[PDB]
């Protein structure tokens, strides 16, 4: 069994809102590198998986994999404008 | 057998607009915020599952996680974009 | 068995748009709220769920609700640009 | 064996309109009344159905539930931007 | 054994299209005022069913019913807007 | 055994063109027509069955139905556009 | 066993292009009446299937020959756009 | 058993393309007609296939044909503008 | 066992760069009539296993020919298009 | 047991990122180009295996390959659109 | 087992934004030159197992390989277009 996940309400600034966005980005940004080592991590393993098993399932999943990583790394560079446009 | 939910019934202000999109945004972000811990959270399960099973499927439950972690965090940034329009 | 619903018939004016404006965003703020309220109580339930049991299916299906989460929160900002550009 | 239905037929005033517009007007906003009563009563059961009967298909079905309540609560906003667009 | 369906052949005019027009859109609201009957209908016997049967399909073809519900109701203003454009 | 259908070969003329236009119009206005009665004919039988027959799927196919005779009914409007567009 | 396919090579003239836009608009206009007649003939017997017989499939069956109707009736007016557009 | 298929190395001017548009231009407006023509074949045999045996199938298949036969159809007109634009 | 591949690599000049494009240019168009071949070959056949076997699945199988055979015409006068806006 | 992948770290230089360009502009090509060879290689081996084997699946699946190859095709073109424009 | 994975938190100056640029430009270029790589080292076994074992399957699998491997390549000369338009 896994410890039940306690949620953590942040603090909002609607009439202050640079300081949400400061914040949100730093957090965005944590999380678009969070996702980029847990799927490069899950990426080598699964190629070798798919390599060695000699089996169609694996090959396209790998597929699905990569095309994943692919629109994780493209939004990286979304997220600069993104922020250029904001500021 | 689960608790039923409680359905709370906000307060709006047809002509006074500014107060219920503060708290709106407020519910957003807040719900936002969530959105990203509950991924995060399942996240990590779900790349340790896939590692060690050697099974293509939870690979690719892994990966849909990964896509949605994605557009969650692109929808942050993109809700700071709508209030900076809105005011 | 389950009650019957009693449908209710709103009162409409064609001449005088601005009062049904008024309480079709006061039903629909109140919806979204409903929404999200539903939503994430589903989400929590579903969390732990697709945590438990090594499943893939719960998993896949958590992330379908994260993505529906999702949209249900950029169309409550969305839902004030609506408003604003009517009046 | 339920009633067959029997089908009231409008007038049409092809070059009056604006006496078609107000009636549809009234029409549209009757149906989409209708519509959320409907949703959020089906909502509120199957909510409770997919949180107890620990079964992925009553989740999944929850959420394109909430997509089509979402769906319909932009469409009665937007009706009203149709009406300012017509004259 | 239903009846076989005798059709009926309209009157077109190609130079003189007003009168064309005028009888389509009769037909087109006619039509839509049909649709909107029919879809009413079904959808309180659909609600009913999907409430009583604790079956996910029930509940995902309510759903489904629900979108072509709103598609119906949208195009009914969307018509108007076209006849405006087309005068 | 159905009769064979017999194709009818229309004359064409590149070089006089308002020709062909004007007898494509009653062509496709007829069988906008056709198509019209075609699916009320329809419509008004397997709501009936839908309405009485306890089964999922046969209120899919309404809905199926539905969207279809709003499909048809959007391109009859536009129709006119199009011929309006023709100088 | 059907008689097999002999394939007749078209005249093509690229540095006189009008003669193969004449001869093509010939063509595809034939075509076109080729195809609603192909429909139309189909849909006639598909509506009287589809009624004689409580069957989900048959109802399904029409709904997309009406599909492709009122796409092969749409395509016959954009036509004469792209052919108004050529000269 | 089929004969393997002998490829034809085409000749091309990188510096003086318009032999090559020109000879490109002959290929695929004969692969147009080619298209046509063994499309057309295909349609009378599956229109009476789909009218004699009594199985959705065929008519369903038929639909597709007809949707293909139509795309084919719109390119071919969109071929000549696709020319002219080439100057 | 078939003979494993040996990639050939291609030489590149980065800012000589109009080479590579003339040799892109030939090696794209040698493919553009490869693949109108390898069709061609392939739908001649293709075309005569749905009139004899009778199945759907043929006639079904053999318009996603034509689909695939339409969209590599249209890339070929596109490829054309794409030279004249390089040079 | 096939061998593990060995990941080569590139070199990057975000202050002169034109050596950067040039590098990843003779990645992109090879690549392409590996590409091209790869789908050739399989398609001719298919293309024999899809006439003979007399199933539906064969041929549908060499047409998926087609389009993955018109695919790659396009974009040789349009990799040297997207150099001109850094330039 | 495999190693649980260690989530390393990146260091993020929302007011200093040139900083996280560079290193993201660098992150961003070395993942997708990591995706390239694999993706090929994938495609070359892919690539004789399709053609070794007479299979529709290993056919579409390496086809849907391609369409990730054509997909990665353009995102790579886009990266720098991204990186172009961020100074």
Do not use: W
């Not at 896994?2 to 400061?22: E, F, M």
């Not at 080598?44 to 798919?50: D, R, S, T, V």
């Not at 629109?71 to 560079?77: A, F």
């Amino acid at each position: 069994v896994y410890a039940p996940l306690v949620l953590r309400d942040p603090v909002s600034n609607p009439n202050n809102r640079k300081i949400d966005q400061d914040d949100d980005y730093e957090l965005v940004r944590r999380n678009m590198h969070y996702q980029s080592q847990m799927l490069l991590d899950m990426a080598k393993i699964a190629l070798e998986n798919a390599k060695n098993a000699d089996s169609p399932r694996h090959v396209e999943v790998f597929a699905q994999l990569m095309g994943q990583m692919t629109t994780t790394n493209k939004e990286m560079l979304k997220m600069h404008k993104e922020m250029k446009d904001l500021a």
